Symmetry: D2
Subunit: 136 residues, 4 copies
């Protein structure tokens, strides 16, 4: 199972059908990836939610401006969200090797020794780690 891929699919799929929110099973590691998506503007925010004893994390999805002429659909904010490292085929990179995602117009989340950081943060703290996902 890859929980993290399963969260990111649950998120991308809820935006594709313009939902206000989506609940993924709670975890500290998922909570910190949500903590970065929220600070960087890809989601509105999240909130812990216990539904009949089980912990969930309720993600509040964000949508951008109305489209340029009578088309009701908002412009999306998460255009591409995707796993890199994973179950069976892991990807690690060191401080010198952190890629600039989509020419600087995208962010990559890394799990590093100093915690879950964006590639721009990682580089600054001088850490490398596991490339969890890329998003723009």
């Amino acid at each position: 199972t890859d929980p993290i891929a399963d969260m990111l699919t649950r998120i991308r799929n809820a935006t594709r059908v313009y939902k206000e929110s989506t609940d993924v099973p709670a975890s500290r590691f998922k909570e910190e990836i949500l903590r970065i998506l929220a600070r960087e503007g890809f989601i509105k925010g999240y909130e812990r939610v216990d539904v009949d004893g089980k912990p969930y994390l309720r993600v509040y999805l964000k949508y951008g401006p109305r489209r340029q002429g009578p088309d009701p659909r908002p412009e999306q904010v998460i255009h591409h969200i995707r796993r890199i490292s994973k179950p069976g085929r892991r990807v690690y990179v060191g401080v010198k090797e952190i890629p600039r995602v989509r020419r600087g117009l995208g962010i990559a989340i890394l799990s590093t020794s100093k915690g879950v950081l964006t590639d721009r943060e990682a580089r600054k703290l001088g850490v490398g780690g596991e490339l969890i996902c890329e998003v723009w």
Copy 2:
């Protein structure tokens, strides 16, 4: 203002963002067109909902099966809905001039003496009336 075309545009636009329901200011006539739209399968149903004294009609939109392959969007049931008889540009058809919409694979909804009728109902009752809208 055109009443009826607000309601049709608001049903069209709710479905294009996969909304569970949309509310239209209530009216005997609006109830009629929804009574017909729901029965020919294009909406789930409606409830007259008064929200704050003012009557509303809570249209419960219908969507079909998910698509073939991981595409999260349901397939739609309302694929086309448009007002034909505008105000100041009224269209009336007398029975033999009731048109066949989309080769016979769409409905027209008439307003007639015999009530509010779908095109085959108007032909069967032999009535003529004003052409409200077409939907397929």
Copy 3:
């Protein structure tokens, strides 16, 4: 392999990305299903095409009117195209059992003793057969 499903997927997939045409490997049976899709308005037409010795059938896709406000995308004509009968799980129906597809607002193609016919034709010639697909 199910050639017929593979044609219908090739067609549905080309409309989803607004292509002018698509070439499926030629066959008499595929040519007659195209002959009905064309007469009923779901495609513009088709044309036989030999490309380096191999026979193909080039389908010319049809699109409906511009959308109701600055959205460039035409309104589609084939909304739903799908196999019923198939490899491994076949479906036959007799003259009395031919379903009305989508309440009369859709067509079903049947392979019958009197050839490939629509359900409306089949019923008229008094034949039943194999439900190849439904489309609206």
Copy 4:
């Protein structure tokens, strides 16, 4: 008329119907903005094409990877493009007032003394200019 916004709208609309190319009436300036759009990856390229004496620019649109699961639509590369400085509503920014578009994950394209420059190029050359459009 606004020239530039015709070109931007025609690139936007071509991609929304997955067109391989779109032609815009040629111009030194249009060449400049395309020179920049192609180099930051948002279009494949262009060819000045004269079609019938009148010069045209044949923009070759770029689209990314197909999506995850049988969804035939490629993912887009141009997700947002809009004219900021209109005619009769001109916007000029002097270097320190050059904005950061979409948190730093989008580009602005300036017209300046030092040529046609993307926002970081204008900050690096320390130039100011008029704000043509934003794209991410």
